[PDB]
């Protein structure tokens, strides 16, 4: 003597929410006759819920999600799911844990001193200063003395072809920004992971001088992470995450997202 299909549910909170912001929907039971309402909201965490019997025999439901991601709202009437139920809700916001490692090189001065080496002998090496002046460099180990501050470009060629790692950049002085677009990344840790199993990827910033590279994993639990600078100038990153869920791995170079960052990374259980 009730009819679940006559139950109507509407409102933004049926499809969309935001972290620490109330999401709301109306349950209209007026045409459903006799029967009880049961309601649950399942997702990354349990969600506080409020209801208000409105004047017009309607019931306003208000919920507050504390963690982003994919939720579902179960609405049953007389132990039967109503039309549209369960409703998929996507909740945007900051993951609850953000785990980052951020690698920086600073070199705040220029000084006409070639007492160092910051950078099979038929090799041509050229350097282009920030002001665009290109000049040939002596030669492993390139001897060029920057006179200018800013991002330099450095190309090393054998037979007139670039070697491994060339062309690259060499920034001296105060960092500010820029260069994120030319940064590269790849590895399975950038599209999926398994809880408790290391997930790797590599980064090539092509920056031989000053720069800042921030790798972050944001999502429902803690991460263990490791980072290695490699001989070739690349970066290895590995992370182990504690719980299954939807995570975000972001690579920022001098404060800007590299081209596919942040990468959505579903993490499965063991
Ligand atoms: Br990799």
């Amino acid at each position: 003597m009730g009819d679940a299909s006559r139950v109507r549910v509407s409102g933004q909170g049926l499809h969309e929410g935001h972290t620490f912001e109330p999401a709301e929907f109306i349950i209209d039971t007026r045409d459903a006759g006799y029967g009880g309402l049961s309601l649950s909201i399942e997702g990354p965490s349990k969600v506080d819920i409020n209801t208000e019997d409105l004047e017009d025999g309607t019931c306003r439901v208000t919920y507050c999600p504390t963690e982003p991601g994919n939720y579902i709202i179960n609405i049953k009437f007389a132990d039967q799911h109503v039309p549209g139920s369960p409703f998929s809700v996507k909740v945007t916001g900051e993951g609850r844990v953000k785990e980052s490692i951020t690698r920086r090189r600073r070199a705040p001065s220029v000084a006409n001193v070639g007492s160092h080496c910051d950078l099979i002998q038929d090799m041509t090496a050229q350097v282009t200063s920030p002001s665009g002046k290109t000049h040939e460099a002596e030669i492993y180990c390139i001897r060029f003395v920057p006179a200018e501050m800013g991002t330099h470009t450095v190309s090393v060629k054998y037979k007139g072809q670039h070697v491994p790692g060339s062309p690259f950049q060499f920034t001296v002085g105060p960092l500010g920004e820029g260069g994120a677009h030319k940064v590269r990344a790849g590895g399975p840790g950038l599209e999926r992971a398994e809880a408790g199993v290391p997930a790797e990827f590599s980064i090539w910033t092509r920056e031989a001088g000053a720069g800042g590279l921030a790798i972050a994993v944001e999502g429902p639990s803690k991460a263990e992470i490791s980072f290695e600078d490699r001989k070739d100038g690349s970066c290895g990153v590995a992370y182990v995450v504690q719980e299954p869920g939807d995570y975000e791995v972001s690579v920022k170079f001098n404060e800007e997202h590299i081209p596919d960052s942040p990468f959505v990374v579903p993490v499965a259980s063991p």
Side-chain angles (χ1 to χ4, degrees), residues 186-188 200-202:
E200 313 197 55
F201 63 91
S202 298

Side-chain angles (χ1 to χ4, degrees), residues 186-189 199-204 230 235-237:
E200 313 197 55
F201 63 91
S202 298
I203 302 168
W204 302 260
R230 297 176 176 141
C235 293
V237 177

Side-chain angles (χ1 to χ4, degrees), residues 151 169 177-183 205 207 253-254 256 258-259:
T151 311
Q169 332 287 110
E177 284 160 42
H181 83 299
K182 93 218 164 66
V183 180
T205 66
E207 178 59 69
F253 183 70
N254 296 337
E256 311 201 48
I258 71 158

Side-chain angles (χ1 to χ4, degrees), residues 136-152:
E136 222 199 296
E138 316 187 61
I139 307 166
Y140 206 37
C141 188
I142 301 162
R143 259 214 275 189
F144 163 89
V145 236
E148 309 175 15
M149 272 162 172
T151 311
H152 292 67

Side-chain angles (χ1 to χ4, degrees), residues 3-15:
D3 194 341
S5 65
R6 302 303 174 164
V7 180
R8 273 196 129 184
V9 191
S10 64
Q12 289 181 33
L14 278 181
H15 74 101

